[PDB]
Amino acid sequence: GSSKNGRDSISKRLGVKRSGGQFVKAGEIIVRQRGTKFHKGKNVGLGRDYTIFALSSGKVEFKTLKGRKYVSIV
Amino acid sequence: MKKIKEAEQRKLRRKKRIKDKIGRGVASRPRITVFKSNRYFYAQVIDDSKGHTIASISTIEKSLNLGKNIDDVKKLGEVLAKRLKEKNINNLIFDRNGYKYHGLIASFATSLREFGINI
Amino acid sequence: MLSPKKVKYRKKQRGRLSGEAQKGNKISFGEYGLVSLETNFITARQIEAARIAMTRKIKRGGRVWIRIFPDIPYTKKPAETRMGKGKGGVDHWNAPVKLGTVMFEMSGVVEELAQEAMSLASSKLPVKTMFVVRRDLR
Amino acid sequence: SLIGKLNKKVKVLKALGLNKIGDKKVHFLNESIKGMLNETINMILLSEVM
RNA sequence: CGAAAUGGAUUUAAGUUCAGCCUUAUUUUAGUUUAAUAGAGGUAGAGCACUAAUUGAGCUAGGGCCUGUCAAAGGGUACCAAACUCAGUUAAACUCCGAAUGCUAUUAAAUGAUGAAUAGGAGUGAGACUAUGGGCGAUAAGGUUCAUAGUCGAGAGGGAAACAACCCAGACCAACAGCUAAGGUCUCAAAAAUGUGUUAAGUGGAAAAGGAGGUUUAGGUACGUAAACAGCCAGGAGGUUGGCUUAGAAGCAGCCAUACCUUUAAAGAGUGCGUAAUAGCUCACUGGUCGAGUACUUAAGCGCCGAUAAUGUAACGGGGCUAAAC
RNA sequence: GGGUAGUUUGACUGGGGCGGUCGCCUCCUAAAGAGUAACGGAGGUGCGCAAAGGUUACCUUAGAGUGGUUGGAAAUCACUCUGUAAGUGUAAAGGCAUAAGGUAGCUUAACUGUAAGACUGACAAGUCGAACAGAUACGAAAGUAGGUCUUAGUGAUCUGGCGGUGGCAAGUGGAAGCGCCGUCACUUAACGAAUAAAAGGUACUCCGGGGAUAACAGGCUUAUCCUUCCCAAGAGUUCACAUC
RNA sequence: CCCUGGUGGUUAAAGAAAAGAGGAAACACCUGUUAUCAUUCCGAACACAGAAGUUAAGCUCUUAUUCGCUGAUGGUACUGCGAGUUCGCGGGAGAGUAGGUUAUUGCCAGGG
């Protein structure tokens, strides 16, 4: 009577790639995620898989509004 | 009660979606918004980098003495164009502001168009 | 027996149980309580043995409240096997108790009879106990 | 000694400048040095330089 | 100068290869630890607001039971019980919440080649234990499999009687110099004396549930110089075989309470012994002789029993020690 | 065509065999960045869709209660409260009110050449991407669209087939053929794929090694076993402990 | 300037419920479907055309904070490190309690 299961996928390495306050240049990836765990603010864009990336050079910042987190470049 | 409340709620949802679809206005190409009351018709040009109304117009203005018809809003758009040209703005983004682009708004917009404003 | 009638998952991982109790540590429904002085697991079946003891000692005098419900499977591999396949099978049910859990509560009878009945109950549990009157009423 | 202690604390001590028992170093107490000394208080002896 | 026993892949699992770790040469200068400021978690913990489990009352649909019953509309509801209310619990695959450390960015100090790039040469890819967090196991294994750090590995010296992984500490060589760490200072065996208490078990110098008028100190509840407790001297009853079940049950098979009264000093529908049934002997109960703490408990410091294998005292290293024990 | 000959007949594995498993995706284990094992705990998958894709515009479920032809607990209709618990082709998770959910119109961006800068990473690979030229779809426009709310529905090289281009063309001019671009054929599933092509026995056995690994003993552990002990409901005419 | 309307900024609910107050202007209700426009039926919504009437509702303001939301100070859990051991240094919840809360503000148009 062997084990009926034991099966796991490859870890996808999600999470925040650039920390709030760090300096990024155009096109950097900031967050990798499934779904808008973090939403888009000023000067960032959302990829087709909800990746957060920087449209211009600046400093990352996270804000909170009504309990939702927004990422911006300032 | 609830029916009027939900009508208001739907209008707000439409307004919000329209706003973030068209994006914000900048001093070069500010945003033109309208408001259609049961009596009158209002238009404002806004620069969101400041939250400032660069120019505005409405049928309340006594001197214009227009009505609330297609003809009247045609003339009103003419006046708005001549008022904006002297402040040298030619590019605008048209926030329909929760309304449907048809009828009065169509005539307003086309009137701004025949007189050299990029909307 | 005492046992849950439906479970999301049949088997669960044995944690490490530690620390005193920060909740369910006060006499609520009755007059006299049977606090524990250790942290351990009380099986359903020891629970019902203690319950029979208390209830039988009490000649209809009052009521007995059980403040723990097992809801924790305890798996055991078959008798003669090796360490291979994995997570054998549920055998009996355990309840978690920490130092300070009230664990049992009694109502109605005189204090002497309650103390006797509840030592009679404590004789069948695997943890040190203490009998407590409300200590803020009489 | 540094033998057998935690890695983080060995790093702190080498950042203070002490490598052996019997090591002597004079330092000016500001917030940084105060934090390092607090980390490694159990392995040091502090005297004051009048 | 100085590793690795890890990651990925493999007709691979005792092999090999790339990365990781090492060294040499050149170039480059910016690791590393703090502190301050500012960021993203969902863990510990906690909580029931979601998904499930669950305790006791309150309420009440619905289901059956019973009853003016036809199976019309009904009524009595011990229950079987949804939902709801109050109180109270459980969760790795629950989260309205939520740290500490850890991680990232900047700056200033502090430490001084520990970073990185190119090129030559590798080795390694069997790990082990200890301190924490876990999974599997049987909260068994010097078990198995991961994470952080240490040591061994590759590490000599001192300590734990002996004892790679524990404690202290990194051996350039020499000195018949000193101060110290762990650990010790009766003796084997280099090093301690004094102060205040505790222990009678050689506890120290193995261990559980439980039992326990051992003792030190502290604190409650009963009770007391207006006589408590133990002893000693008396009563310890009358109504009343309490009504009974039973054959009997007269206080002591057994049911029920003893809101059963009186003389009351005090006498219980009796504490035990024992009688078929009593009978009979005793006690709580109360009075006199005596003359201060006693009777039940609570928290700690040491103790007692439980204690229990086979070559030989053998669970202090030995001698011995009432301190030379705590 | 075993008459004869050359060979193959996998690995992981709490010894081996038997059984089970082998790629990819989701969650937990995972100890609040990333990563992290076991024959640890639960599932899915080798697709579907010419719209269930693109865009514009407009709408909002499920549940409870309530009033209603059949109609009943529950179908469709209306209102109140609740406020995403509903629904998203397909597992789970993360998301989804501006909806990524529902409906309708038009439509093919389910595009060509590219791509600053990155994420993840032994390598091979995989992933995101503003913006630019060509040419469309929708929209008044701003703008969006390089398939699908996101993450699984996959397969290297060699060989060969098909279409295009006209680069190579063994003296020259052609051609066979090859190269280039587009593209098709592998449960190569043991899924980084030893061959285009592969099962067993040996107790008649042999060799090189291993306590890296089993059987007999020693050691660790005590589930099981054995020996007691704690609690005493009771049985014993009454009487827990004469005894059980 | 204030009121009203429009449109933003700063996030703690700036949440709903009930009661009361007004309406000059403004906003909304409201009126007709005939023209272009819209619904898988319906001028409800959308759209066009307007001024008969009203605070009734929406809206603004005022209320007992009725529900919700927010919530200290101490203490506890937990935790990094430590030759002090349930101790030494530092960090510090959740729940509960005392409370609190029916936003604030920039510039455009109308007239006060």
Side-chain angles (χ1 to χ4, degrees):
Chain A
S2 309
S3 165
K4 189 59 69 184
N5 47 23
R7 260 171 276 102
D8 203 16
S9 57
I10 299 185
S11 300
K12 287 306 177 315
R13 279 93 171 150
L14 314 173
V16 176
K17 301 295 159 183
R18 253 55 163 172
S19 62
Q22 197 174 3
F23 166 82
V24 304
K25 49 185 194 289
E28 292 277 59
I29 290 175
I30 290 170
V31 187
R32 308 222 75 151
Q33 41 181 27
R34 283 86 171 93
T36 59
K37 199 164 160 181
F38 304 95
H39 292 251
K40 53 185 288 298
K42 173 177 183 58
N43 283 356
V44 303
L46 199 70
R48 69 170 294 276
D49 70 356
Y50 301 114
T51 311
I52 308 280
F53 60 97
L55 299 188
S56 48
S57 181
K59 277 192 205 318
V60 174
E61 75 156 47
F62 293 77
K63 289 267 300 187
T64 315
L65 293 171
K66 294 272 166 198
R68 307 271 202 79
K69 293 265 205 292
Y70 289 84
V71 187
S72 314
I73 292 281
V74 297
Chain B
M1 183 179 71
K2 191 152 169 320
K3 308 312 160 290
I4 296 89
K5 281 167 165 298
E6 61 86 19
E8 292 294 328
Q9 276 303 132
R10 287 187 311 214
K11 188 163 49 166
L12 265 74
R13 300 150 53 80
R14 284 201 303 263
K15 213 181 305 307
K16 196 178 284 183
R17 157 186 59 164
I18 291 162
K19 179 170 176 40
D20 65 357
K21 289 285 289 304
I22 80 172
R24 298 172 181 85
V26 184
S28 296
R29 182 179 83 268
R31 165 186 48 169
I32 175 68
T33 73
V34 311
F35 168 72
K36 184 167 57 163
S37 160
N38 296 93
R39 302 286 168 140
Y40 296 116
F41 187 103
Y42 305 75
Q44 299 202 29
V45 179
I46 300 97
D47 174 60
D48 300 12
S49 60
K50 317 297 189 66
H52 285 347
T53 303
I54 305 298
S56 65
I57 195 177
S58 199
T59 54
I60 296 182
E61 299 184 40
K62 285 75 84 172
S63 57
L64 291 163
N65 65 44
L66 278 299
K68 194 181 169 284
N69 288 316
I70 296 99
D71 294 329
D72 312 314
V73 298
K74 282 165 150 69
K75 310 309 293 315
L76 185 142
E78 180 60 25
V79 178
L80 183 63
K82 86 113 174 180
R83 199 173 315 165
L84 184 62
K85 285 179 296 265
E86 53 89 7
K87 291 170 172 181
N88 66 10
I89 312 296
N90 292 4
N91 294 327
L92 290 182
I93 51 174
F94 193 88
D95 183 359
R96 62 213 186 89
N97 181 43
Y99 302 123
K100 194 178 80 63
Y101 187 109
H102 176 47
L104 272 292
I105 295 192
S107 309
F108 192 30
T110 189
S111 294
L112 282 79
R113 274 194 190 109
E114 291 88 4
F115 301 81
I117 308 295
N118 269 277
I119 60 170
Chain C
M1 293 297 172
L2 206 54
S3 166
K5 63 188 191 293
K6 186 188 311 307
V7 290
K8 277 210 286 198
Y9 303 123
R10 294 173 299 113
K11 321 172 181 180
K12 61 171 67 169
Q13 325 175 3
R14 43 189 69 111
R16 302 294 99 192
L17 195 46
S18 79
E20 289 89 0
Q22 313 294 329
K23 39 181 181 158
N25 56 3
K26 302 201 287 208
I27 281 155
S28 293
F29 303 148
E31 289 96 298
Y32 320 101
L34 184 59
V35 184
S36 64
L37 277 298
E38 302 203 357
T39 174
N40 219 332
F41 291 108
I42 313 287
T43 76
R45 194 182 191 271
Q46 312 165 342
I47 284 176
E48 61 86 20
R51 185 202 67 87
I52 302 148
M54 289 195 227
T55 294
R56 195 142 33 103
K57 179 65 167 178
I58 300 299
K59 299 288 94 176
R60 309 179 183 273
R63 314 167 43 69
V64 182
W65 282 275
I66 303 168
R67 295 282 301 285
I68 45 181
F69 189 92
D71 66 66
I72 287 190
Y74 176 104
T75 69
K76 202 168 187 169
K77 265 189 168 302
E80 186 71 13
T81 55
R82 293 191 164 173
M83 295 299 292
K85 316 307 188 55
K87 217 57 173 178
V90 56
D91 181 351
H92 65 102
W93 302 78
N94 293 104
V97 301
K98 321 177 81 177
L99 181 144
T101 297
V102 162
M103 184 181 288
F104 269 123
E105 192 169 357
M106 186 180 289
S107 78
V109 302
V110 69
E111 170 181 330
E112 295 294 328
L113 189 47
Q115 179 167 235
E116 180 64 27
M118 268 183 49
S119 84
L120 200 75
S122 158
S123 67
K124 320 216 167 294
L125 302 175
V127 289
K128 291 228 202 198
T129 61
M130 201 157 39
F131 170 93
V132 288
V133 195
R134 291 181 181 176
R135 295 285 74 79
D136 294 317
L137 277 298
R138 60 256 183 193
Chain D
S1 163
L2 307 196
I3 298 155
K5 307 310 179 306
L6 264 68
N7 188 30
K8 154 178 49 191
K9 294 199 162 172
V10 169
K11 288 197 267 216
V12 182
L13 291 174
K14 275 177 174 299
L16 271 163
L18 316 163
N19 307 291
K20 313 187 169 305
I21 304 191
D23 266 333
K24 318 266 182 287
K25 286 216 82 68
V26 288
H27 283 340
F28 175 77
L29 281 177
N30 67 80
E31 293 314 317
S32 309
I33 310 285
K34 186 172 304 183
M36 284 190 248
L37 296 199
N38 276 335
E39 291 293 330
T40 75
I41 188 171
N42 74 305
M43 317 174 52
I44 50 160
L45 180 65
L46 301 186
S47 166
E48 191 177 9
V49 175
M50 283 75 73

